[PDB]
Amino acid sequence: GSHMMFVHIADNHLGYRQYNLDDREKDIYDSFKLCIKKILEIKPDVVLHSGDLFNDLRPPVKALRIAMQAFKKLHENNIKVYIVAGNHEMPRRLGEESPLALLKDYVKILDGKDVINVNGEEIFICGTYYHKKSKREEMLDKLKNFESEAKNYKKKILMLHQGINPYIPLDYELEHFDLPKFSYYALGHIHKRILERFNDGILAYSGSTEIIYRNEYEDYKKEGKGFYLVDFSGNDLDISDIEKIDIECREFVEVNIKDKKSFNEAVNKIERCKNKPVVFGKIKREFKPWFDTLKDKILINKAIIVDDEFIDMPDNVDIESLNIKELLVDYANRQGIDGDLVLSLYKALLNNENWKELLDEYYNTKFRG
Amino acid sequence: MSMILKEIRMNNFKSHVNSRIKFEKGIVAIIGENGSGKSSIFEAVFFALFGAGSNFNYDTIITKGKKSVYVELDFEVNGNNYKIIREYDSGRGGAKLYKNGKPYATTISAVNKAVNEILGVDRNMFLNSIYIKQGEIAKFLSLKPSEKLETVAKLLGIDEFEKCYQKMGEIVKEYEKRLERIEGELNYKRLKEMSNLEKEKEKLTKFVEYLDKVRRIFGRNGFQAYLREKYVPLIQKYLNEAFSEFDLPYSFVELTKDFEVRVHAPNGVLTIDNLSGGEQIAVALSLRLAIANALIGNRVECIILDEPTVYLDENRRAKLAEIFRKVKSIPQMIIITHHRELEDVADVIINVKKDGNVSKVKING
Numbered sequence: 194g195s196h197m198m199f200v201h202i203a204d205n206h207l208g209y210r211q212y213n214l215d216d217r218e219k220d221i222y223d224s225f226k227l228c229i230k231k232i233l234e235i236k237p238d239v240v241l242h243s244g245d246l247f248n249d250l251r252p253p254v255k256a257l258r259i260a261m262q263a264f265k266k267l268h269e270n271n272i273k274v275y276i277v278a279g280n281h282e283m284p285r286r287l288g289e290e291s292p293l294a295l296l297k298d299y300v301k302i303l304d305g306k307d308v309i310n311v312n313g314e315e316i317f318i319c320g321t322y323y324h325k326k327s328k329r330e331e332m333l334d335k336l337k338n339f340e341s342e343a344k345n346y347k348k349k350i351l352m353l354h355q356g357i358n359p360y361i362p363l364d365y366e367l368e369h370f371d372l373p374k375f376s377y378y379a380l381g382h383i384h385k386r387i388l389e390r391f392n393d394g395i396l397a398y399s400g401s402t403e404i405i406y407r408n409e410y411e412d413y414k415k416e417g418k419g420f421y422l423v424d425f426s427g428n429d430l431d432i433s434d435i436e437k438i439d440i441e442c443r444e445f446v447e448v449n450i451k452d453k454k455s456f457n458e459a460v461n462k463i464e465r466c467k468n469k470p471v472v473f474g475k476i477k478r479e480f481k482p483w484f485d486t487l488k489d490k491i492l493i494n495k496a497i498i499v500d501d502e503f504i505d506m507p508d509n510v511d512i513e514s515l516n517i518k519e520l521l522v523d524y525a526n527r528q529g530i531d532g533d534l535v536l537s538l539y540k541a542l543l544n545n546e547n548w549k550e551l552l553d554e555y556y557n558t559k560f561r562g
Numbered sequence: 563m564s565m566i567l568k569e570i571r572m573n574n575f576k577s578h579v580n581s582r583i584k585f586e587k588g589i590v591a592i593i594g595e596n597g598s599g600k601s602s603i604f605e606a607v608f609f610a611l612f613g614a615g616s617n618f619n620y621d622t623i624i625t626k627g628k629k630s631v632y633v634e635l636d637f638e639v640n641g642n643n644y645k646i647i648r649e650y651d652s653g654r655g656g657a658k659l660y661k662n663g664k665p666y667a668t669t670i671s672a673v674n675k676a677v678n679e680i681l682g683v684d685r686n687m688f689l690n691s692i693y694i695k696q697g698e699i700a701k702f703l704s705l706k707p708s709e710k711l712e713t714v715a716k717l718l719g720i721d722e723f724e725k726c727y728q729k730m731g732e733i734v735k736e737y738e739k740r741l742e743r744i745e746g747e748l749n750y751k752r753l754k755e756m757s758n759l760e761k762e763k764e765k766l767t768k769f770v771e772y773l774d775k776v777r778r779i780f781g782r783n784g785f786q787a788y789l790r791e792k793y794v795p796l797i798q799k800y801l802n803e804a805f806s807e808f809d810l811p812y813s814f815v816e817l818t819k820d821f822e823v824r825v826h827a828p829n830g831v832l833t834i835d836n837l838s839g840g841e842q843i844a845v846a847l848s849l850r851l852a853i854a855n856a857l858i859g860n861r862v863e864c865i866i867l868d869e870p871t872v873y874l875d876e877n878r879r880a881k882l883a884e885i886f887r888k889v890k891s892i893p894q895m896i897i898i899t900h901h902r903e904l905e906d907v908a909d910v911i912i913n914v915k916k917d918g919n920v921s922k923v924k925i926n927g
């Protein structure tokens with residue numbers, strides 16, 4: 194008795210065609226179809242979609258299809274599905290409709306309150322679409338009702354597609370304290386997986402569904418991309434009753450080909466590879482022809498042919514804000530002149546001050562010629 | 563030179579018979595069909611400030627029906643808050659300039675020499691760094707390498723030094739008459755050691771020396787040339803730091819001594835000659851934004867770019883939208899395209915429709 198399980202999923206980016214590559218397009222569709230399958234094979238009670246199902250606002254026919262099909266099944270096998278539209282899905286000239294509208298009888302598009310019955314027990318859901326940081330305020334409003342309307346129920350779930358302060362440290366449109374106490378936070382927008390306690394409840398970023406940027410690979414092997422299977426049986430939840438489903442992605446491989454020892458380590462990766470990987474990074478110029486050798490074990494080579502001349506770090510952080518004043522002074526000394534003066538002679542000449550003075554001064558004062 | 567545009571009002575200005583427009587900061591973005599009225603909004607901004615000098619054709623900017631032309635623009639510059647006005651009634655106009663409420667100059671010629679120092683760049687150094695007209699995204703790189711060092715010498719702060727040079731050339735004038743003075747008195751002037759005026763003659767002479775050796779620390783072949791050199795590497799950082807986000811097939815981009823662009827391909831170096839339309843515009847855009855970052859807190863202004871996405875393909879447009887968003891060293895970039903991308907990433911989204919020859923601005927967000 195009493196058994197209620199939902200699948201939290203996000204950022205599929207259907208329709209994305211990385212490096213203009215027919216294959217990578219198919220890769221994105223495949224890794225999604227897989228999820229829908231696995232999820233169809235788990236007949237979970239509810240599916241939470243945290244946004245960015247599509248890539249653009251006018252996704253291609255085929256992506257639209259591939260979705261409408263998968264979501265068809267979902268609701269054909271009596272699965273309830275909730276989704277908030279992400280940044281890629283919020284129409285900018287209203288009068289034109291988000292692509293999500295094409296899934297309207299398969300899915301409920303959240304921008305409000307709603308309650309679902311599973312095992313007579315009543316649970317609470319709220320969510321809303323991607324809000325720029327600009328309109329970040331009107332948002333707090335939204336989460337207020339949400340908070341209020343939600344106090345009444347024991348179990349509550351929040352769906353949002355924004356980025357939040359501690360979790361993306363860079364570009365974010367909401368902060369940690371900036372949100373009320375819920376039981377699970379099904380989030381979208383961060384592509385790396387994220388799962389951790391918070392405000393008595395579990396917060397989560399299902400993550401993407403493939404490698405959309407090269408930098409998600411290292412992040413991919415540690416934590417693996419897929420979705421979250423959440424067992425909301427007992428009265429509470431921990432990282433324990435949140436099971437994670439995995440999924441295989443196109444493989445990436447970073448080569449930094451400097452010497453003979455390296456060109457080999459690079460071989461030790463490409464063939465040590467499930468399918469044809471995408472290779473990226475550096476490759477000294479003298480090794481290029483002997484790499485094109487592997488142009489058939491490779492999917493695509495986005496690595497940089499470095500000139501033989503240069504042999505140092507260029508991506509090396511060297512924060513330079515040339516302090517004009519500092520430099521001028523440091524310089525003038527190298528030559529033999531009172532920098533601390535010629536500098537002062539400088540500020541003075543511009544503000545149209547009395548130079549005679551400054552000179553007449555220094556002359557008598559410090560000038561021992 | 564921290565400059566920002568608040569709002570602007572215009573009357574009888576080409577297709578803009580009458581309309582006012584509010585300029586919110588960040589990702590400002592005018593948008594509209596062809597001829598909606600997009601560039602005029604910034605033809606006008608540019609009139610207000612620098613009014614067409616020569617007695618040019620005023621039948622150009624005046625709505626083809628009308629007789630007059632009124633434009634007034636509101637902009638916070640170096641902290642303060644100003645307002646310039648310029649008009650024209652069949653044959654004659656003049657320009658008033660308010661400073662927080664209190665006018666600093668009130669004549670065509672007055673407000674003129676006033677707007678140059680309250681901004682720091684002439685009319686053409688303006689179009690070379692603050693207002694980048696439609697067609698001229700690549701202009702800079704198209705310049706003679708002297709013309710390049712000339713416009714960069716101003717945008718960097720090197721011109722001021724050339725002032726200090728020719729200043730120190732006049733200052734070495736005084737302490738040389740003074741020195742002649744003493745020479746003339748010391749006219750008719752061992753066991754013979756040097757007198758007091760002889761000791762001053764000397765000191766004053768080893769002074770001039772010191773003075774000149776400071777003049778030359780201001781010279782073209784001097785500190786101007788150190789500063790420059792100590793500047794390129796840094797610009798390069800940012801150039802390549804952004805050029806890469808375009809995913810073009812190229813190692814890095816060398817930025818030379820004399821601001822030449824050298825595109826390192828796997829077997830060879832390509833110049834802005836060999837690059838392609840779209841490719842030129844990328845490096846172009848990347849360089850402008852690049853120098854912006856380089857003087858991050860040396861001078862933080864706004865920028866107007868008109869169709870930055872010219873020639874650029876579907877992939878590149880969006881890469882560039884992603885770059886602009888990411889851009890931090892400029893508070894106001896208003897951008898004028900008709901393209902989808904830059905829209906869907908915009909703080910503001912100022913829409914221009916044109917109702918039969920007359921244009922109407924419907925500010926959004």
Ligand SMILES: Nc1ncnc2c1ncn2[C@@H]1O[C@H](COP(=O)(O)OP(=O)(O)OP(O)(O)=S)[C@@H](O)[C@H]1O
Nearest residue numbers: 576577596597598599600601602622623624625626
């Ligand atoms: N002196 C004038 N009197 C009345 N209308 C004018 C005058 N000068 C230009 N226009 C009209 O204003 C429209 C162009 O305004 P612009 O700012 O230059 O164009 P735009 O909205 O940027 O369109 P683009 O550049 O092709 S995407 C054209 O249709 C002109 O017909």
Ligand SMILES: [Mg+2]
Nearest residue numbers: 600601696868
């Ligand atoms: Mg235009």
